[PDB]
Amino acid sequence: SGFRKMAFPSGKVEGCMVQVTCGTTTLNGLWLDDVVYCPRHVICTSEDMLNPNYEDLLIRKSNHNFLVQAGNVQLRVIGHSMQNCVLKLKVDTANPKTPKYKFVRIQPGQTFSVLACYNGSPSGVYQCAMRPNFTIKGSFLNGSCGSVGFNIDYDCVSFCYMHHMELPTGVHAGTDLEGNFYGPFVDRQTAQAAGTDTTITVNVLAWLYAAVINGDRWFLNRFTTTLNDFNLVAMKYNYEPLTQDHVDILGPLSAQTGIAVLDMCASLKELLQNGMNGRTILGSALLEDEFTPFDVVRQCSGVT
Amino acid sequence: SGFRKMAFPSGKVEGCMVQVTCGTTTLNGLWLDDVVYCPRHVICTSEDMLNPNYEDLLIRKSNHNFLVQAGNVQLRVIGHSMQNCVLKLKVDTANPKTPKYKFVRIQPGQTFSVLACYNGSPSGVYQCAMRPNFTIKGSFLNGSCGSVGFNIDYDCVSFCYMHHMELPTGVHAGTDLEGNFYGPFVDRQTAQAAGTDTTITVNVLAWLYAAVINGDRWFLNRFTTTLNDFNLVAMKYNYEPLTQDHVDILGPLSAQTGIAVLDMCASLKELLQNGMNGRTILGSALLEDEFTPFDVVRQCSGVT
Numbered sequence: 150s151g152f153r154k155m156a157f158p159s160g161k162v163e164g165c166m167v168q169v170t171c172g173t174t175t176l177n178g179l180w181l182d183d184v185v186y187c188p189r190h191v192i193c194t195s196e197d198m199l200n201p202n203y204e205d206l207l208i209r210k211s212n213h214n215f216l217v218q219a220g221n222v223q224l225r226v227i228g229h230s231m232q233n234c235v236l237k238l239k240v241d242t243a244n245p246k247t248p249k250y251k252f253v254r255i256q257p258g259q260t261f262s263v264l265a266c267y268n269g270s271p272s273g274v275y276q277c278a279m280r281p282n283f284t285i286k287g288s289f290l291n292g293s294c295g296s297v298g299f300n301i302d303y304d305c306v307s308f309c310y311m312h313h314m315e316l317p318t319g320v321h322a323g324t325d326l327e328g329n330f331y332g333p334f335v336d337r338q339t340a341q342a343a344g345t346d347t348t349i350t351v352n353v354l355a356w357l358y359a360a361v362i363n364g365d366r367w368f369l370n371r372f373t374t375t376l377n378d379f380n381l382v383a384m385k386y387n388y389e390p391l392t393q394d395h396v397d398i399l400g401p402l403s404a405q406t407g408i409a410v411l412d413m414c415a416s417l418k419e420l421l422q423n424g425m426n427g428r429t430i431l432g433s434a435l436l437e438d439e440f441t442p443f444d445v446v447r448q449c450s451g452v453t
Numbered sequence: 454s455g456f457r458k459m460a461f462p463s464g465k466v467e468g469c470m471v472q473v474t475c476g477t478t479t480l481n482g483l484w485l486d487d488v489v490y491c492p493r494h495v496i497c498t499s500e501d502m503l504n505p506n507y508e509d510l511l512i513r514k515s516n517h518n519f520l521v522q523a524g525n526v527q528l529r530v531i532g533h534s535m536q537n538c539v540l541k542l543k544v545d546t547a548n549p550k551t552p553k554y555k556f557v558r559i560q561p562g563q564t565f566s567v568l569a570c571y572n573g574s575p576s577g578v579y580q581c582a583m584r585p586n587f588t589i590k591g592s593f594l595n596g597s598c599g600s601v602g603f604n605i606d607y608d609c610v611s612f613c614y615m616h617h618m619e620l621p622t623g624v625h626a627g628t629d630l631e632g633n634f635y636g637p638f639v640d641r642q643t644a645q646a647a648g649t650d651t652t653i654t655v656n657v658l659a660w661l662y663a664a665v666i667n668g669d670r671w672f673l674n675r676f677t678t679t680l681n682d683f684n685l686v687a688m689k690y691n692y693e694p695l696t697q698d699h700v701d702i703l704g705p706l707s708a709q710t711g712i713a714v715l716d717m718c719a720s721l722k723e724l725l726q727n728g729m730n731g732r733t734i735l736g737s738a739l740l741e742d743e744f745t746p747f748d749v750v751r752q753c754s755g756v757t
């Protein structure tokens with residue numbers, strides 16, 4: 150028992166982290182097979198970031214201008230190309246530590262682990278969720294760009310995020326591994342405000358199920374609700390609408406606990422309307438939304 | 454910017470995890486050089502756990518009864534010994550992935566990462582603190598025993614915890630890597646109640662400094678206090694007494710923010726007396742105490 154914000158073991162991803170330097174800019178790269186992926190803004194100076202023309206800036210760069218270092222050994226760059234907002238640097242050596250991997254583009258509400266890196270070196274690992282406004286609330290300093298987000302299915306690493314930017318509000322934006330930003334964000338130092346950071350309702354419900362499995366049951370009430378009634382309350386509280394797809398996804402947790410999904414919705418509705426009254430659920434004084442139903446099942450069953 | 458509950462990158466520890474089976478009991482072992490460390494209760498049946506005589510139970514076990522498997526390959530056991538509550542199984546092969554390491558016994562209030570494992574396989578990594586009552590609030594299921602807690606200083610892994618038990622209250626107990634339990638706990642299925650789980654005051658103050666560094670400043674007030682006055686309030690709220698040693702440890706954060714330690718104590722005193730009033734600090738609705746002053750400095754400076 151016990152329920153923690155758990156990240157995936159990061160070893161398979163640590164084996165892929167490299168340092169990429171272009172001119173005076175140093176950030177992280179991801180080395181998979183003979184390709185190093187990194188944010189294209191490695192080619193920018195701080196001044197270029199205000200209004201960069203990436204195609205134009207890239208013309209002035211050759212293979213030898215991209216310095217790639219894996220540990221304390223230099224990799225030879227034999228090709229470079231821009232794909233959306235990432236650069237792909239072809240190196241002459243396949244990464245011997247390349248795990249089985251996929252590039253996936255996640256949906257808002259999905260969680261993943263981030264291996265925060267500086268100078269190609271891992272500093273820490275933490276669990277994130279793609280917010281409904283397509284930002285992530287990470288822990289990234291200058292030099293962390295190119296750090297990646299991922300999930301692991303047994304031996305397969307699915308890379309879903311590469312860190313590119315910090316918005317003026319301190320929230321983070323980045324791309325999938327095809328270089329496409331999540332949401333409307335662009336790799337330019339300009340006014341980019343994030344939309345409403347709504348709460349991921351299906352994740353809160355999953356976490357309430359994790360709470361019941363682990364003994365925290367005080368919030369269970371005598372009520373039920375309907376999807377439409379619950380959604381009127383969800384809208385009032387800036388929660389994402391709950392769909393029948395979310396109810397179906399919560400099916401296994403409902404079966405394991407014997408608590409019907411709509412009954413858990415009624416418990417969540419009362420928590421929204423009444424607050425916690427100074428009580429906690431799984432050591433939290435707020436409703437946690439960065440555990441998906443799959444995360445709760447995985448953690449509660451001991452999947453390796 | 455941004456502040457997350459971050460664990461150390463787990464790769465160096467993943468390379469040490471093995472599965473240990475003795476009879477019908479399977480748990481995890483830590484393979485460092487030619488020794489595999491694991492909880493001595495691997496020799497017990499579920500019935501033995503009610504009242505085990507470990508020296509007596511161990512007489513019936515030979516080297517060939519300890520089955521050690523690293524990945525899908527069997528290790529040869531050439532010796533075994535009991536040191537306090539751990540067994541040390543000498544194997545004929547040094548772990549080729551042994552990192553630079555130390556065995557450290559931590560103090561209450563210190564934090565560490567746990568690599569939760571099942572069947573010698575890593576399932577996830579999370580950040581813990583040794584509670585003042587010598588329990589940890591982990592996420593461990595049956596089969597997780599032998600999972601370890603650790604800190605990393607550049608390339609040196611300091612192992613501080615090995616998981617042994619879940620108390621009837623769902624909190625966790627274990628040993629250092631010399632097999633000595635933290636606190637008064639014993640490896641027996643008996644009545645073991647934990648003492649008061651007080652709040653680690655110096656960690657809360659460190660986290661309030663992390664909050665100020667990252668822009669959450671609403672809780673800063675116009676007051677100051679003294680150590681004695683603050684400690685009268687700390688006692689009332691089941692917070693650990695703050696000592697001059699803790700003030701000295703918070704010195705660097707005080708210098709960086711320009712907020713004197715006793716002024717931050719006065720802010721904490723008002724938060725204790727008035728509550729959060731529905732507001733949050735670093736996305737939390739409670740005062741977080743599982744970040745040490747060193748963790749805040751490390752995370753806020755990007756140490757790899």
Ligand SMILES: CC(C)(C)NC(=O)[C@@H](Nc1ccc(CCC#N)cc1)c1cccnc1
Binds near residue numbers: 193198292316
């Ligand atoms: C655009 C600003 C806000 C300045 N930085 C970032 O948005 C990110 N850092 C960054 C570093 C260098 C370059 C190239 C320009 C040069 N040299 C581009 C970006 C960042 C910072 C903090 C946390 N996360 C991400």
Ligand SMILES: CC(C)(C)NC(=O)[C@@H](Nc1ccc(CCC#N)cc1)c1cccnc1
Binds near residue numbers: 150477494497595619
């Ligand atoms: C003593 C009890 C409460 C039953 N288990 C534990 O305290 C721990 N499991 C455990 C497994 C096997 C053995 C040997 C007996 C056999 N076979 C000893 C201990 C545990 C469980 C859940 C989470 N953390 C740790």
